[PDB]
Design a protein around this ligand. Sequence first.
Ligand SMILES: [Mg+2]
Ligand SMILES: [Zn+2]
Lengths: 860, 208, 335, 79, 59, 59
Amino acid sequence: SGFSSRSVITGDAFRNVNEVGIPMEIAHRITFEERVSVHNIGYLQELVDNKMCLSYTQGSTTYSLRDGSKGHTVLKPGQIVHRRVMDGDVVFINRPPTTHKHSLQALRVYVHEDNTVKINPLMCGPLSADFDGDCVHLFYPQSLTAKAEVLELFSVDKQLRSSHTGQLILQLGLDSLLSLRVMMEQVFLDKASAQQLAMYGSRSLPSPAVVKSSKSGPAWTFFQILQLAFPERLSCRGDGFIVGGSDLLSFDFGVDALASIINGIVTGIMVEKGPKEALAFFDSLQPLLMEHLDPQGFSLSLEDLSMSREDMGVIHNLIVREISPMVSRLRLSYEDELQLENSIQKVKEVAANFMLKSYSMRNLIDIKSNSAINKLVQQIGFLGLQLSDKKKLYTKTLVEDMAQFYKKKYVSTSSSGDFGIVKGCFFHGLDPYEEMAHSVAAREVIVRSSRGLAEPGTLFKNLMAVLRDIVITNDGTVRNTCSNSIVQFKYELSSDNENQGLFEAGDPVGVLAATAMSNPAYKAVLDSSPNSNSSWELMKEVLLCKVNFQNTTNDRRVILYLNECRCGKKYCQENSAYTVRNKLKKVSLKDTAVEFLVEYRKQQAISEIFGMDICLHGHIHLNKTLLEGWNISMQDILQRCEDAINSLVQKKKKKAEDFKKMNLSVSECCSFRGPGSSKDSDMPCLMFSSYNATDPDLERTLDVLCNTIYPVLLETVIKGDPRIASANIIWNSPETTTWIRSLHASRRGEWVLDVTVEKSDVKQSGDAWRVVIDSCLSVLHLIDTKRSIPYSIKQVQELLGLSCAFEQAVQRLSASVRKVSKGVLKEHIILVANNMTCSGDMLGFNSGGYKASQFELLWN
Amino acid sequence: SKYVDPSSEESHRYYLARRNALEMLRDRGYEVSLEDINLSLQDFRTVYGERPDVDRLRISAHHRSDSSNKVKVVFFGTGKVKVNTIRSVAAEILSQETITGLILVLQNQVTDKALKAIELFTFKVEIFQITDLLVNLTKHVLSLRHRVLTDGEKKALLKQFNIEEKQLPRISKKDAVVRYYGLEKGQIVKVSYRGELTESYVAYRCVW
Amino acid sequence: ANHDHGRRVLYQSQKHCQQAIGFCSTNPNIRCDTLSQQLFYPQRPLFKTMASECLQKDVLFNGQNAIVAVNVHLGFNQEDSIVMNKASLERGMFRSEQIRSYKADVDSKDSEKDEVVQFGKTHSKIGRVDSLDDDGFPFVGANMHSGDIVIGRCTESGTDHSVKLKHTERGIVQKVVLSSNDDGKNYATVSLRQVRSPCLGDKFSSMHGQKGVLGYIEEQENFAFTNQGIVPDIVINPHAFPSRQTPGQLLEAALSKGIACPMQKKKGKSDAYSKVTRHATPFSTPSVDDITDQLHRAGFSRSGNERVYNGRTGEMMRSLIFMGPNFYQRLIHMS
Amino acid sequence: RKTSKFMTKYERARILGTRALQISMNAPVMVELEGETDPLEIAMKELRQRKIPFTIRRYLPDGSFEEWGVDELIVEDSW
Amino acid sequence: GVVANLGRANPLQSLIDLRRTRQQVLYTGRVGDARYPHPSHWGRLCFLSTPDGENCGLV
Amino acid sequence: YRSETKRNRFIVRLSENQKAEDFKRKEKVLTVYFLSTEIPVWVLFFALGVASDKEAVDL
Ligand SMILES: [Mg+2]
Ligand SMILES: [Zn+2]
């Protein structure tokens, strides 16, 4: 179908949106066939007497060109004619598939020299291109059926609403929105500029707003200038716009929402008069803007990038006021990186507040967006945190010796500030240490966004293997095509009443959902920003689930809520937070020890046993302050050691420790420590003996058997459940910035218990929560069931049932895909979740999960 | 808040298990009183042994649906189950005019004596574990009020859209709601959701 | 170089410096290789760096000193696209010159150490032989077309083994080189020459990783002009700077504009050309006050801007325009 | 009945193809024209004023089907 | 990953092509800091310019 | 102790116990010495003519 193209694309604002410019270098080498009919011959003989035609191949198959002076030779109606590429044809534009973002468009051809492709600047969005050297392929519908279905399905006005978001695929771009802003800040126009702009769109011109004054002549407003792009007899109601009879009656102030109030009017025109009036609005508005910018100009300065000096002294008095005393806590505290970023963005916002007090910088940047408001503080303010150990690709050794390398005139002269913090900006320059630190940061972003990235590549095929054969049938039942089973009874909500503009029977909505879910994956991976990297695996937790229980560490967590108020006891909440941890937090013997001393002497007379079976006496000394800190007694240690060493030799283990002594925990043995330690016998507990070899024949070969039970004495637990791996009291801030909850609207500060079980979780799923509930029995009264789910969404399906996991998968995919792409049709989420939850339980979208039209035919 | 923390801990594990099983038979629509399920744990442990209680008359929960549907349980406080225990507790109790029994396993049950548990003619039995029954999954915030449909409405569902039995969105016969209400292959359940995305959505499932 | 983002400096110092069109060699009669390229008028930058001064190689800079104004044009410089001046292009600016070489070979003379494909004419009119001589090769002033015969490597009686041009190679013959090997393996070398002006699809870049495509070539009398009558040579879009974080290009333009201007009040009290900064060394760079006070000494405005009048309406454009020279580059793989 | 009184995009994309193909294969015009010589432009107008003689046969997933004339279906475009 | 061709498009491409050093690929299981500037590069190798792609930071 | 030439050169390894049943103390074995042939350290002391102990502790 033309099969190839090699050309750069370029832009052109004064030529219509669905028009495309072909080079004559390739336009004279591409053929459109056409059939000679009873109708077309008065046109075709004009096309064939001169040039612009080609071989006149009929059934006699004559490959003679329009070159050998054969003349008119007025053809038989019925023959077929190869010709060149005239204007007004249709083409089909695409690139090689870097992504299957819907680059499929149909465009009208204009033929020129200057061998590039000239598209409108509004097609930089839908075709996903910029103008620094992109190469596109062009395809030509040769058959008439091809032209029929391509023109009927794939034109711009047919595709004017996004089938992946539900908004318009054409919004006002770079210069046009700037033209609207400077036209808003200059509300009045003169006569001459008004009548000059009136030449472009339509609707001649309204009467002037101010028809006279004392000084000037007439004066127009710019809302009357906006009227000229309208179609005829428009009547729509808006949030700020009021249109009655092709006039713009009132328009709200809000310059901040200007890309929406324009976006309101185009949507109203598409509702009231269709898509072919919305395209006329764009094609009358864009040159009307680009000519309004022409006798004013717009530029940058050096005074725009120069922040003032006393304000520079203000911002430098905040690195060493609330950031150096916070990095004084970063010396030992690790996981306050979001507190770190909270204080950082508190600095960055007041930094960005100053450089919007200039005329040119307000108008080139989108004020609201977090993406490009910190970039400008990186070149007027300061950079910030370039190094951490949580940017997880360079190892900890690079961080520790980059911290050490701060001897390079940073310890020889200073200790103020810290490594990883840059107090300088791009505009004033970076001295070589922080230049090196910025280089490792930018290098790490290059490595991260460069490596891998085939995980959405294989995820696209793993979503296409199963979501392919799903259509909307003729009655509305969304069914698998190869099985004819209802996956979903009805599509989009409240579209069964007879109002159209919506989905139809025949739409391959599974293939819509595959692409509409695959695009936020690439938008989250190719940007290595922290909010775009935190939300990349929240899709992988839901979409890449495995049904066969691998017993991972996500399969072990359980969150515990505790809400039993009492109302006014004042820190009964935090006392409730920690005692349930105290019943479950594991402490052992091997941690509180210091040393270990076996000794034949000092208990020769304490050995009173008539046959002298007793010679060796292994002390295991503790430390006092940790035994006295966490309120751990000494006799309960005797209890928990004696019953464990009994109950494990009752287990079929050996007969090596049957005669264990386990005497007493005394807290003061004797003036011991011959080999130099020099302490005064502070908890020297568990002064056992091992007389199993009665009448010990060899001293040295019996001392090793007193070193095969020292480990099993070390590995015992004292206070806490043996099954608990950890327990943590965290997150006094339940707002919407944190992970997925079941309820929180009421409070704003509730404490929780992040509880993790060790690997005693058997192959049966759902046993970690089973153990945690079988653990907290003595303290169930102040823990709060009806809440406190397990964490992984397969285990919730194991506990609460399938239909709870359905809503949880919906909410998790929703809150994940919001944070990268900011708007997505919910019907694709619901379709993906119902395809997971159709055949029994939740089948994932991977290699393991894989292991478990025809609607009409014409007559006449 | 405030905290006391003494317990004969084993009796707590039967208080919660018994109260959950009586709530389950209450929601299966059987004749069970208010006070037998709404007792406290203190007056539980007084009348029923503070620490010890095995093979007690607590287990004798046995009730009628409306006239003649009989379900009783047999708690096993043991640490090992064989065929002799279950035969000795069933071959005497089936002569008390029952048609369905329940099993409360505590340790584990093995497949080595499984055919002798499903040999029982006209007397279907259900099993559990004690450690699953310490909560109410129906009382949880994230649980959904199911509404089971009758046979006539099932046929009207199959004939409305001219659809076969085996074409529906399925649900497994081991789901925590399927095993709870005592449901059967073929029976159609209906769920009404609530959520910021899925609010007015409804969905039908039959058991496979 | 310590003002730009690190990614931009990586771009410039690994790819764009290695691709820019500039000097080639000082004896082009011997280099017989595929696609030698060269400008006409190469230059050095207005500023100075430390290493370029200690090395003293002006072949470390391959491009020309364009004058750049940041302003909105009619919509042709959007999406990282650039706008040139046709009058500047017609005086020789960025005009390049490429030379490509075409090669063939045949055995010794007669030995095995018919399949003899000896270089000759084969007068029986196989393809197009308007320019070939009797030896099998064209002459040294030819005008080889879109698709001709470039080496007559044909045998005595069989069909042609001759090398021919494909669809997109053409040009004036520069030289013919005929060498051989030890075992007589005779080698043939023909070089074609072309002169190119930059077309509407070509790519350019600054010294700061800020590249584009020439999208619109504009005639001279429509540009904005200053009160001296100066016109820019390249116009770019002000939406490129606040995102990509290269203030080094604006500082470079202000430095070079402060170098090349004259210096008033020169009568008495000084020679008035000695406190002039020319050193933009990377890690030791002039301050903002040095540059702005130099622009105050040279007579211009301290903010870097400059007042222009329009080339169409002719009246005062309301927004002051930032102008000044910048060293730009022209990259290979033209289209 | 029961089967979506509008017309799909996919059925327009086939009926205009077959109509314009037969018009380019020597079929009589059925509408008044203004000198248009493009068969898709020709085929658009009898759709635009309900003048096409086709019968569209909508299948059903159970096994039955429907019978509909292209005059009956609303390709309206009203808003 | 040894002897290559010599570029001639600039006279600067030859200088860049004659001054290069290369870490081999041993095995991709935790190569560590093998593609990140280490503070022993100060004054000897370059901590700003490197290729990007298949061998970013190895040459 | 590496040597690029002289491909018979050795290493001393202390974190291997030869077993892990209950636990053994870490003892030094002068492991593989001629691309085979592990030896303990003290045989290679008294092969090289150490007189006694307490000088090898002072070595
Ligand atoms: Mg491009
Ligand atoms: Zn002791």
